[PDB]
Amino acid sequence: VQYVRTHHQHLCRENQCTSALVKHIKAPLHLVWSLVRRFDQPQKYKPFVSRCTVIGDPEIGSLREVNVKSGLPATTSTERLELLDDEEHILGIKIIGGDHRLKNYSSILTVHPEIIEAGTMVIESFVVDVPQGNTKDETCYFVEALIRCNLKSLADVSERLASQD
Amino acid sequence: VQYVRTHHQHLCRENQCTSALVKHIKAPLHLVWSLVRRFDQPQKYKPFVSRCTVIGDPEIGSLREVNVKSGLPATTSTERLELLDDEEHILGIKIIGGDHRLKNYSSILTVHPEIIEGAGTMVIESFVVDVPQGNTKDETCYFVEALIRCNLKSLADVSERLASQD
Numbered sequence: 001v002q003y004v005r006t007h008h009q010h011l012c013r014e015n016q017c018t019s020a021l022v023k024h025i026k027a028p029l030h031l032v033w034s035l036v037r038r039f040d041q042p043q044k045y046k047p048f049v050s051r052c053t054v055i056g057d058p059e060i061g062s063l064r065e066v067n068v069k070s071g072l073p074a075t076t077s078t079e080r081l082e083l084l085d086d087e088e089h090i091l092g093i094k095i096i097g098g099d100h101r102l103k104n105y106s107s108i109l110t111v112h113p114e115i116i117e118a119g120t121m122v123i124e125s126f127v128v129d130v131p132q133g134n135t136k137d138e139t140c141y142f143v144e145a146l147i148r149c150n151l152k153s154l155a156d157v158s159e160r161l162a163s164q165d
Numbered sequence: 166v167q168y169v170r171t172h173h174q175h176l177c178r179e180n181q182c183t184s185a186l187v188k189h190i191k192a193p194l195h196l197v198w199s200l201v202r203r204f205d206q207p208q209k210y211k212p213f214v215s216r217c218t219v220i221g222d223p224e225i226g227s228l229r230e231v232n233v234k235s236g237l238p239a240t241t242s243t244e245r246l247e248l249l250d251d252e253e254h255i256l257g258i259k260i261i262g263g264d265h266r267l268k269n270y271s272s273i274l275t276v277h278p279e280i281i282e283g284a285g286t287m288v289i290e291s292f293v294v295d296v297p298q299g300n301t302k303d304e305t306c307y308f309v310e311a312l313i314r315c316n317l318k319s320l321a322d323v324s325e326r327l328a329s330q331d
């Protein structure tokens with residue numbers, strides 16, 4: 001699309017991979033945005049987050065500590081809010097630490113209005129270091145699986161709330 | 166495609182999910198098929214297999230025990246050759262055991278000739294698998310799909326590399 005080139009086509013280092021995922025949601029922008037924007041409450045649509053803690057009211061620079069469910073190669077992740085534009089509908093996160101295999105993970109999510117035939121298009125893209133011993137493809141296929149899980153869930157939650165009002 | 170309706174559109178139990186993946190490879194069919202069909206040698210293109218054991222010459226009904234690399238929610242898998250048609254280029258596998266979370270995994274893979282830019286081959290692999298208690302259909306299928314993309318991409322890489330050399 002037009003938007004992929006604007007925010008989502010990333011230049012990454014040799015030891016890195018990058019990808020972008022698109023999701024269409026039969027819900028209005030305001031529902032979808034007010035779910036993704038909530039930095040201290042990803043567990044509301046992210047299926048693998050069991051717990052999330054943020055000290056103070058969230059602002060740019062804030063850290064969150066997220067605990068993930070059993071069955072994953074990770075138990076905790078520490079994440080920083082890099083960008084949050086309520087007017088342009090842009091969210092930037094960088095994972096800065098924790099239990100897991102994702103070093104230098106950086107993320108940008110954008111939300112856009114679309115066609116009922118009101119809908120919403122969510123694009124999330126990332127960059128991440130390839131762990132020693134894995135390939136670019138392996139790393140990016142796995143991370144994409146996580147993101148698909150998130151955006152599909154975000155879709156379901158959003159469309160559920162839309163049907164109620 | 167029109168092929169996915171023939172071999173790859175599966176009906177599911179409620180507790181199951183199903184999906185199909187396509188890969189185009191810039192290599193001739195003979196190379197791709199030779200790799201895919203070697204039931205006792207999946208580690209030749211499957212990047213997560215560290216070891217494979219098949220007792221006796223592989224026939225229909227044969228079992229393989231695959232050992233898997235560290236870093237996965239699995240160490241071993243035991244798998245059965247359900248179907249191998251060397252003329253139609255069809256392979257069917259069923260995962261019957263191991264210490265992993267894929268109960269009742271069934272797999273079908275077909276290979277088809279294509280015209281590459283100037284030659285090429287299209288690989289379709291689809292599966293059915295139980296949703297583990299506590300996961301959703303989406304989670305289950307998105308994860309298994311990650312594994313299959315890894316395998317088919319590697320298959321593409323190995324195939325095209327071999328095609329370079331003649």
Ligand SMILES: CC1=CC(=O)CC(C)(C)[C@@]1(O)/C=C/C(C)=C\C(=O)O
Nearest residue numbers: 048068072073074076077100143146
């Ligand atoms: C579910 C999970 C699995 C891991 O192995 C790493 C980590 C714990 C960071 C993670 O929460 C990853 C989450 C990702 C990639 C995106 C997100 O949630 O926006």
Ligand SMILES: CC1=CC(=O)CC(C)(C)[C@@]1(O)/C=C/C(C)=C\C(=O)O
Nearest residue numbers: 213233237238239241242265309312
């Ligand atoms: C790589 C891996 C990870 C697991 O969690 C289960 C298992 C060990 C079965 C597996 O080998 C799965 C392989 C799959 C789904 C298809 C294949 O390779 O044809």
